[PDB]
Amino acid sequence: MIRAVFFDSLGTLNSVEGAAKSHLKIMEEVLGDYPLNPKTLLDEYEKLTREAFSNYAGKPYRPLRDILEEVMRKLAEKYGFKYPENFWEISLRMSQRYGELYPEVVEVLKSLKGKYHVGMITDSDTEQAMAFLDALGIKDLFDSITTSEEAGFFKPHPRIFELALKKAGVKGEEAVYVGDNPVKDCGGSKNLGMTSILLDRKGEKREFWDKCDFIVSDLREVIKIVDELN
């Protein structure tokens, strides 16, 4: 029986519109005066961060702050603007103001509380995760928060799931993992016998649907799936 439902953070609980708006504001702050289109800097940042996250997948942890800073330095050298030493702080400030949850997140986490352990499992640095959670006003909705920093490895390495399962005191087969990355989240979680749910709100990731037990376009189907399983 499913006793625990764990969630990814970025791309699963925060809206892409909120993530794009916050990140555009970050790049505007970074630049401005500087004659580079912030939307282009954002595109490049998103491209180079995707590549880095791909590079580190399943590998020993390195601080995401360091990886994102490395990217931003590369972009500053590329484009000839000054790397802002306080990029991490700017990123936090913009994410706090402009980040937004998908519309159903609170309703869904709330409906799970008390009935199932509700956890988060994220690749983010712990300070980043706590920041994410606090700013979006969802910290106390989670019974456990587990990060790649704590496990020592990035998704899909098993240890991040194993840690989360240990915090919750459940076995993998008693748990569901919901995420937006079919390989890292769904594939990763399945190695511990967890039930995997992909959030693909737009059906953009059909190419990798076969890596996931369930595909939802809305998190309200998560309760649907869990109740049906049990």
Domain residue spans of the chain: 2-15+99-230, 16-98
Q: What is the resolution of this structure in A?
A: 1.6
**Max intra-chain CA distance, the chain:** 57
**Among 3.40.50.1000, 3.40.640.10, 3.40.50.300, 3.30.70.1450, what is the CATH number of 2-15+99-230?**
3.40.50.1000
Residue entry with tokens 């986490």: 109
SS3 of 145, please? strand
- Give Cα separations from 149 to 8, 60, 145, 176 (angstroms): 14, 9, 11, 21
Query: In angstroms, rounded to a whole number, what is the distance separating the alpha carbons of residues 128 and 92?
Result: 8
Query: In angstroms, rounded to a whole number, what is the distance separating the alpha carbons of residues 189 and 101?
Result: 23
Distance in angstroms between the alpha carbons of the first and the last residue of the chain: 6
Closest CA to 148 of 47, 52, 58: 58
- Using left for φ > 0, alpha for ψ between -120 and 50, and beta otherwise, residue 147 falls in beta
- Using left for φ > 0, alpha for ψ between -120 and 50, and beta otherwise, residue 11 falls in left
For residue 134 the two structure tokens come to: 């606090």
Residues 200, 215: contact at Cβ < 8 Å? yes
Residue entry with tokens 């594939």: 187
Query: In angstroms, rounded to a whole number, what is the distance separating the alpha carbons of residues 95 and 8?
Result: 17
Elucidated via: X-ray
Query: In angstroms, rounded to a whole number, what is the distance separating the alpha carbons of residues 75 and 36?
Result: 11
Residues 149, 131: contact at Cβ < 8 Å? no
Fold topology of 16-98? DNA polymerase; domain 1 (1.10.150)
**Beta sheet of 214-216, edge-to-edge order:** 144-147, 117-122, 4-7, 175-179, 195-199, 214-216
